[PDB]
Amino acid sequence: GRVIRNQRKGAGSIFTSHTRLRQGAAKLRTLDYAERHGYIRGIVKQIVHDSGRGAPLAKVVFRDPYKYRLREEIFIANEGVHTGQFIYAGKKASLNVGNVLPLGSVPEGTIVSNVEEKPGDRGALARASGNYVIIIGHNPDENKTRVRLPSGAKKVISSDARGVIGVIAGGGRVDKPLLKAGRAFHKYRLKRNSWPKTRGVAMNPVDHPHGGGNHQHIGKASTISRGAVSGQKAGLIAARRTGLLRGSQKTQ
Amino acid sequence: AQRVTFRRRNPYNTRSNKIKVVKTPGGILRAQHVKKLATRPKCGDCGSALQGISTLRPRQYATVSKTHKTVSRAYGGSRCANCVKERIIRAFLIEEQKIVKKVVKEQTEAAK
Amino acid sequence: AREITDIKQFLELTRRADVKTATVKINKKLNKAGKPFRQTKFKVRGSSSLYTLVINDAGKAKKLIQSLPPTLKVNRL
Amino acid sequence: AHAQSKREGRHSGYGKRKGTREARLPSQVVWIRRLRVLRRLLAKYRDAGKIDKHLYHVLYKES
Amino acid sequence: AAQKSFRIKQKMAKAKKQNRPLPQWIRLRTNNTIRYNAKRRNWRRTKMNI
RNA sequence: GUGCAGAUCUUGGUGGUAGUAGCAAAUAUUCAAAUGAGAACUUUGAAGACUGAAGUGGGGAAAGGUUCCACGUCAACAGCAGUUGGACGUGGGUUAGUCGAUCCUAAGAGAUGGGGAAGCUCCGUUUCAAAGGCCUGAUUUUAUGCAGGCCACCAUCGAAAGGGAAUCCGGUUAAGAUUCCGGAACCUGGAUAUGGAUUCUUCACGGUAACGUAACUGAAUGUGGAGACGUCGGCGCGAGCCCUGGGAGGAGUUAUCUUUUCUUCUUAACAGCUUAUCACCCCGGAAUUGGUUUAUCCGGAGAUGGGGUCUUAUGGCUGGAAGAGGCCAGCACCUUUGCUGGCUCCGGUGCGCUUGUGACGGCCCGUGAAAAUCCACAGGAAGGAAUAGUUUUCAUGCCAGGUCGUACUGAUAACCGCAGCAGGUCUCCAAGGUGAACAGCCUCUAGUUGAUAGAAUAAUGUAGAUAAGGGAAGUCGGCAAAAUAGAUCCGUAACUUCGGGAUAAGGAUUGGCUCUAAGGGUCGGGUACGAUCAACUUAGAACUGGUACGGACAAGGGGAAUCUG
Ligand SMILES: [Mg+2]
Ligand SMILES: [Mg+2]
Ligand SMILES: [Mg+2]
Ligand SMILES: [Mg+2]
Ligand SMILES: [Mg+2]
Ligand SMILES: [Mg+2]
Ligand SMILES: [Mg+2]
Ligand SMILES: [Mg+2]
Ligand SMILES: [Mg+2]
Ligand SMILES: [Mg+2]
Ligand SMILES: [Mg+2]
Ligand SMILES: [Mg+2]
Ligand SMILES: [Mg+2]
Ligand SMILES: [Mg+2]
Ligand SMILES: [Mg+2]
Ligand SMILES: [Mg+2]
Ligand SMILES: [Mg+2]
Ligand SMILES: [Mg+2]
Ligand SMILES: [Mg+2]
Ligand SMILES: [Mg+2]
Ligand SMILES: [Mg+2]
Ligand SMILES: [Mg+2]
Ligand SMILES: [Mg+2]
Ligand SMILES: [Mg+2]
Ligand SMILES: [Mg+2]
Ligand SMILES: [Mg+2]
Ligand SMILES: [Mg+2]
Ligand SMILES: [Mg+2]
Ligand SMILES: [Mg+2]
Ligand SMILES: [Mg+2]
Ligand SMILES: [Mg+2]
Ligand SMILES: [Mg+2]
Ligand SMILES: [Mg+2]
Ligand SMILES: [Mg+2]
Ligand SMILES: [Mg+2]
Ligand SMILES: [Mg+2]
Ligand SMILES: [Mg+2]
Ligand SMILES: [Mg+2]
Ligand SMILES: [Mg+2]
Ligand SMILES: [Mg+2]
Ligand SMILES: [Mg+2]
Ligand SMILES: [Mg+2]
Ligand SMILES: [Mg+2]
Ligand SMILES: [Mg+2]
Ligand SMILES: [Mg+2]
Ligand SMILES: [Mg+2]
Ligand SMILES: [Mg+2]
Ligand SMILES: [Mg+2]
Ligand SMILES: [Mg+2]
Ligand SMILES: [Mg+2]
Ligand SMILES: [Mg+2]
Ligand SMILES: [Mg+2]
Ligand SMILES: [Mg+2]
Ligand SMILES: [Mg+2]
Ligand SMILES: [Mg+2]
Ligand SMILES: [Mg+2]
Ligand SMILES: [Mg+2]
Ligand SMILES: [Mg+2]
Ligand SMILES: [Mg+2]
Ligand SMILES: [Mg+2]
Ligand SMILES: [Mg+2]
Ligand SMILES: [Mg+2]
Ligand SMILES: [Mg+2]
Ligand SMILES: [Mg+2]
Ligand SMILES: [Mg+2]
Ligand SMILES: [Mg+2]
Ligand SMILES: [Mg+2]
Ligand SMILES: [Mg+2]
Ligand SMILES: [Mg+2]
Ligand SMILES: [Mg+2]
Ligand SMILES: [Mg+2]
Ligand SMILES: [Mg+2]
Ligand SMILES: [Mg+2]
Ligand SMILES: [Mg+2]
Ligand SMILES: [Mg+2]
Ligand SMILES: [Mg+2]
Ligand SMILES: [Mg+2]
Ligand SMILES: [Mg+2]
Ligand SMILES: [Mg+2]
Ligand SMILES: [Mg+2]
Ligand SMILES: [Mg+2]
Ligand SMILES: [Mg+2]
Ligand SMILES: [Mg+2]
Ligand SMILES: [Mg+2]
Ligand SMILES: [Mg+2]
Ligand SMILES: [Mg+2]
Ligand SMILES: [Mg+2]
Ligand SMILES: [Mg+2]
Ligand SMILES: [Mg+2]
């Protein structure tokens, strides 16, 4: 039979990201002298819409400490930051929405976005519109910090790892119904070519494990093992449970 | 009732192919191609069209004399007056308060 | 490409360097409302430009015509 | 000749009409004309002082 | 076409030249065999594929 | 490599079929002359029509490649013909500093230090690399070694619709033209000298300000701007087209009628002065809130008002430039072909049409490229005058601008479909009437009049129409056909997610002609009105006809349910 749809995506032909209009990668400043000893000041020169993104970017310019020139950065904008505002980044820096501080330097309950996984990676976690992470504790010996990510997971990372105070802007985007095919259409038009989706059960056997039969139906359990091999994994992969989730979610 | 043709190989209505109709001394109608319109230069501080400055397509600015490219105040062909007004007042008051900031913490060190 | 109203500036041009040829044009035209009169345009060919002075007064014309440098090539009509 | 009789209000009956009243003469066109004429009267009555700016302002919003 | 490369224009020229009837004096040579030009070509019958 | 009747045998040749099927889509032809051996088919004149500016008109892109043009010419070819041709023979023809390529970057493609792979090669593109070159100074052996300081930007290819230095009008050829000729410009590069400006207060003054200008030094470095950007809506304005008054010409009709019908009356790039919605400055200090758009937005973060500043889209006058071009008359004569004249003037109108553009508004989990390149500002390195210096962003002047494409078709015959195939194949310009209209139908300009022909009009057909009484009884089934239809007015059910259902359903009216009424612009009013000019809309009223009138064209059948998405 045929190579199924989820196998063809990895070869990246018609499936690569539609990148032309994007403002450029959002990152924190490089972690340098200023940021790990002192603080350094910047101005948000603009806050701007990035294509295929939920949340606005903020263009933030700084002075180059080692050379006379301006150096401009692209930040994900936290809700409430504004044009003309001064941004402070460094180990010793006041605790205010929009500033970037090492996770060690903020008290528990602090709310931060675009937080680094390792120190220096210029931010990894909690970048999507509406999201943040909460600092749930410190271990000053071995200087770690325990945080809770948007997924509900709780991870422990270096207290040197930087984050930015506040939550990411443009929240509530997903509360509004798309209402029609076209709105979805233009949505994925600026992301990648994932839409619309043919059901495997509407296909012929060559095309898909679910394909075929004189009635539409899966024909065997749609829960597939991790051990499964490419061309086998479609449906519910490695599911530990299945069915309507009753009762409260929200991990203890 | 007299119709007209493009004067160049390019058959299509692209922005570089903009056309105008003109009556000649031959007494007949004829197309003449038209360069895209130039846009007014903008203040770097705010972004209004800055007054006093002539508006040409970028390379034509090299064919014109310097008075068309400036106004007589500092930051002339660059910033918008009222913007320059601000960075004067701001500069001054900040450079002042900078004195106020030093002598106050000069005493704070001495009495504490 | 250029027009001149200064009868002094004009003569200066006619004696300048690069200027070899020239031409004088005569036009019948009407004055104000009722009657006609005789217009004459003095055209001087400069290297990059053709200067033309229009003398509406018939008198200044004849006077101006002889004032022309004798070594200048002039085309009549 | 025909154009003349039309100036005389001829060949205008209901049997001579194919486009709708709107398509023939849009409402908005009619209104914009009117509201501009009213707007234009108030302004000159104020400028001449025939009407005082307070009465004008009222008539403006009522227009 | 109608705005060409020189390369194409060149081939077009060699093509023009090759299009003529057999020069008749050849027919008179000793042991002449060629009767007519057998490679003749026409723009509405065979296309020359660039 | 030895014997054929066969193998739906192989190649070639040939029959009956048969002078048979046929050569019937795209409205359409006709009279005469000329030419010629020969004319239904060529050329010319006439007539009848057509395409009807959403073209059968005028050009291009892909593609073709000489099909373009002239002369000669009919063996084959153009499924009749042929004197004709996109055929045959022989020649001629494509002119650029400004139009394109060329330059830039897009998706993308792809060398290099490298890392894989037995290897053809695969991966990577700034990636674990000692990755390169500008500005001038140091030379007065001299030609370019070293002295600074930068820049670490790290190939290149990739758009004849993206970005982009700069040209127009008239004339001209058998066939070329924004390319030639004539005149008049502009750009870029290289040289430069005179004039002006500037300076003894060295690197200009003026204006309260917005900002003004003929100029008015400015290295490294840095920063800003232009290039540079969606879509729809109404409103404002420009251009060309459309409509139209007076006059000055030429043409048509004139039994009768028409101060009539048709037509000419034009002005390029470029340059000077001038012209703008928006924006901004100065004075002033606002409730009795005011200003104000078609569209409700603005003001103590300074409105309304008065006075000014700016962009120059765009228009006006003048230069170009009447000398050109257009239209007439009056003479000349085998010719090349002239010559002489006159006139080419002044207005009006707009929900018009196309297109351009402005200030606004609507929309988005869509917010609608990049690079070359050009300019500016911050900075102040440095270089500079009184016995004479600085200036080429002001004026004028000198030299130069290479290589390749440039014909023509662009389609019911120049491309692809075996072809001169009823198919397919990207796009610009767009007149008058009727009408809501880029609809249909008729017309002007331009272009066509191509598609074998003649004679008859049996059956059966294809395509177009009509039928008394009945009215789906026909059929698997109302298939096919018929009915309906524009617009104004009246009137409109169940049900419903309250948005709909709805043009529901059901009704009346509609020509011609002659009147009445309502609806606007502009100017002077001391610190009630008058005068003038220019527009089809809407309603109402008489008269009139073989009761007709969305008179052709154009133009929904409706209702009650079931299944189902
Ligand atoms: Mg990608
Ligand atoms: Mg898809
Ligand atoms: Mg699905
Ligand atoms: Mg699906
Ligand atoms: Mg299926
Ligand atoms: Mg399978
Ligand atoms: Mg299975
Ligand atoms: Mg199945
Ligand atoms: Mg199922
Ligand atoms: Mg052309
Ligand atoms: Mg467009
Ligand atoms: Mg100016
Ligand atoms: Mg200026
Ligand atoms: Mg300075
Ligand atoms: Mg309305
Ligand atoms: Mg008015
Ligand atoms: Mg109001
Ligand atoms: Mg072939
Ligand atoms: Mg081949
Ligand atoms: Mg043998
Ligand atoms: Mg044998
Ligand atoms: Mg046998
Ligand atoms: Mg045999
Ligand atoms: Mg046999
Ligand atoms: Mg046998
Ligand atoms: Mg046989
Ligand atoms: Mg026969
Ligand atoms: Mg027959
Ligand atoms: Mg047939
Ligand atoms: Mg015929
Ligand atoms: Mg004929
Ligand atoms: Mg017709
Ligand atoms: Mg039509
Ligand atoms: Mg052509
Ligand atoms: Mg023959
Ligand atoms: Mg043929
Ligand atoms: Mg034949
Ligand atoms: Mg024949
Ligand atoms: Mg030939
Ligand atoms: Mg030839
Ligand atoms: Mg060019
Ligand atoms: Mg080149
Ligand atoms: Mg490679
Ligand atoms: Mg290239
Ligand atoms: Mg290009
Ligand atoms: Mg282009
Ligand atoms: Mg010409
Ligand atoms: Mg020639
Ligand atoms: Mg031609
Ligand atoms: Mg020339
Ligand atoms: Mg010249
Ligand atoms: Mg130069
Ligand atoms: Mg001066
Ligand atoms: Mg820049
Ligand atoms: Mg920019
Ligand atoms: Mg673009
Ligand atoms: Mg030009
Ligand atoms: Mg004012
Ligand atoms: Mg003033
Ligand atoms: Mg002005
Ligand atoms: Mg209106
Ligand atoms: Mg926008
Ligand atoms: Mg500029
Ligand atoms: Mg100069
Ligand atoms: Mg060179
Ligand atoms: Mg041509
Ligand atoms: Mg043809
Ligand atoms: Mg072909
Ligand atoms: Mg065809
Ligand atoms: Mg006309
Ligand atoms: Mg036929
Ligand atoms: Mg026929
Ligand atoms: Mg027949
Ligand atoms: Mg019959
Ligand atoms: Mg009948
Ligand atoms: Mg019957
Ligand atoms: Mg009945
Ligand atoms: Mg019945
Ligand atoms: Mg029966
Ligand atoms: Mg029955
Ligand atoms: Mg049935
Ligand atoms: Mg029925
Ligand atoms: Mg039917
Ligand atoms: Mg009937
Ligand atoms: Mg119903
Ligand atoms: Mg009536
Ligand atoms: Mg009236
Ligand atoms: Mg049923
Ligand atoms: Mg459906």
Curated annotation (Swiss-Prot), chain A:
It is found in: Cytoplasm. Gene3D superfamilies: 2.30.30.30, Nucleic acid-binding proteins, Ribosomal protein L2, domain 3. There is a cross-link at K45, K92, K118, K144 (Glycyl lysine isopeptide (Lys-Gly) (interchain with G-Cter in ubiquitin)). GO terms for biological process: cytoplasmic translation; maintenance of translational fidelity; ribosomal large subunit biogenesis. Transmembrane segments: none annotated. The modification Phosphoserine is found at S51, S94, S158, S159, S248. One of its GO terms (molecular function) is RNA binding. Keywords: Cytoplasm, Isopeptide bond, Phosphoprotein, Ribonucleoprotein, Ribosomal protein, RNA-binding, rRNA-binding, Ubl conjugation. Its main location: cytoplasm. Disulfide bonds: none annotated. PROSITE patterns: RIBOSOMAL_L2 (PS00467). Component of the large ribosomal subunit (LSU). Mature yeast ribosomes consist of a small (40S) and a large (60S) subunit. The 40S small subunit contains 1 molecule of ribosomal RNA (18S rRNA) and 33 different proteins (encoded by 57 genes). The large 60S subunit contains 3 rRNA molecules (25S, 5.8S and 5S rRNA) and 46 different proteins (encoded by 81 genes). There are 2 genes for uL2 in yeast. Belongs to the universal ribosomal protein uL2 family. This is Large ribosomal subunit protein uL2A. It comes from Saccharomyces cerevisiae (strain ATCC 204508 / S288c). The lineage of its organism: Eukaryota, Fungi, Dikarya, Ascomycota, Saccharomycotina.
UniProtKB/Swiss-Prot annotation, chain B:
It is found in: Cytoplasm. Coiled coil: none annotated. It comes from the Eukaryota. One of its GO terms (molecular function) is structural constituent of ribosome. Its main location: cytoplasm. GO terms for cellular component: cytosol; cytosolic large ribosomal subunit; preribosome, large subunit precursor. One of its GO terms (biological process) is cytoplasmic translation. InterPro entries: Ribosomal_eL34 (IPR008195), Ribosomal_eL34_C_sf (IPR038562), Ribosomal_eL34_CS (IPR018065). Keywords: Cytoplasm, Ribonucleoprotein, Ribosomal protein. The keyword Cytoplasm applies. The keyword Ribosomal protein applies. Component of the ribosome, a large ribonucleoprotein complex responsible for the synthesis of proteins in the cell. The small ribosomal subunit (SSU) binds messenger RNAs (mRNAs) and translates the encoded message by selecting cognate aminoacyl-transfer RNA (tRNA) molecules. The large subunit (LSU) contains the ribosomal catalytic site termed the peptidyl transferase center (PTC), which catalyzes the formation of peptide bonds, thereby polymerizing the amino acids delivered by tRNAs into a polypeptide chain. Present with 23600 molecules/cell in log phase SD medium. There are 2 genes for eL34 in yeast. Belongs to the eukaryotic ribosomal protein eL34 family. This is Large ribosomal subunit protein eL34A. It comes from Saccharomyces cerevisiae (strain ATCC 204508 / S288c). The gene is RPL34A.
From Swiss-Prot, chain C:
It comes from the Eukaryota. Belongs to the eukaryotic ribosomal protein eL38 family. This is Large ribosomal subunit protein eL38. One of its GO terms (molecular function) is structural constituent of ribosome. Component of the large ribosomal subunit (LSU). Mature yeast ribosomes consist of a small (40S) and a large (60S) subunit. The 40S small subunit contains 1 molecule of ribosomal RNA (18S rRNA) and 33 different proteins (encoded by 57 genes). The large 60S subunit contains 3 rRNA molecules (25S, 5.8S and 5S rRNA) and 46 different proteins (encoded by 81 genes). Its main location: cytoplasm. Component of the ribosome, a large ribonucleoprotein complex responsible for the synthesis of proteins in the cell. The small ribosomal subunit (SSU) binds messenger RNAs (mRNAs) and translates the encoded message by selecting cognate aminoacyl-transfer RNA (tRNA) molecules. The large subunit (LSU) contains the ribosomal catalytic site termed the peptidyl transferase center (PTC), which catalyzes the formation of peptide bonds, thereby polymerizing the amino acids delivered by tRNAs into a polypeptide chain. It comes from Saccharomyces cerevisiae (strain ATCC 204508 / S288c). InterPro entries: Ribosomal_eL38 (IPR002675), Ribosomal_eL38_sf (IPR038464). Keywords: Cytoplasm, Ribonucleoprotein, Ribosomal protein. Present with 50200 molecules/cell in log phase SD medium. It is found in: Cytoplasm.
From Swiss-Prot, chain D:
Residues 1-21 are annotated as: Disordered. The modification Phosphoserine is found at S27. It comes from the Eukaryota. It is found in: Cytoplasm. Belongs to the eukaryotic ribosomal protein eL19 family. Component of the large ribosomal subunit (LSU). Mature yeast ribosomes consist of a small (40S) and a large (60S) subunit. The 40S small subunit contains 1 molecule of ribosomal RNA (18S rRNA) and 33 different proteins (encoded by 57 genes). The large 60S subunit contains 3 rRNA molecules (25S, 5.8S and 5S rRNA) and 46 different proteins (encoded by 81 genes). eL19 lies in close proximity to the binding site for eukaryotic initiation factor eIF4G. Component of the ribosome, a large ribonucleoprotein complex responsible for the synthesis of proteins in the cell. The small ribosomal subunit (SSU) binds messenger RNAs (mRNAs) and translates the encoded message by selecting cognate aminoacyl-transfer RNA (tRNA) molecules. The large subunit (LSU) contains the ribosomal catalytic site termed the peptidyl transferase center (PTC), which catalyzes the formation of peptide bonds, thereby polymerizing the amino acids delivered by tRNAs into a polypeptide chain. Present with 97700 molecules/cell in log phase SD medium. There are 2 genes for eL19 in yeast. This is Large ribosomal subunit protein eL19A. The lineage of its organism: Eukaryota, Fungi, Dikarya, Ascomycota, Saccharomycotina.
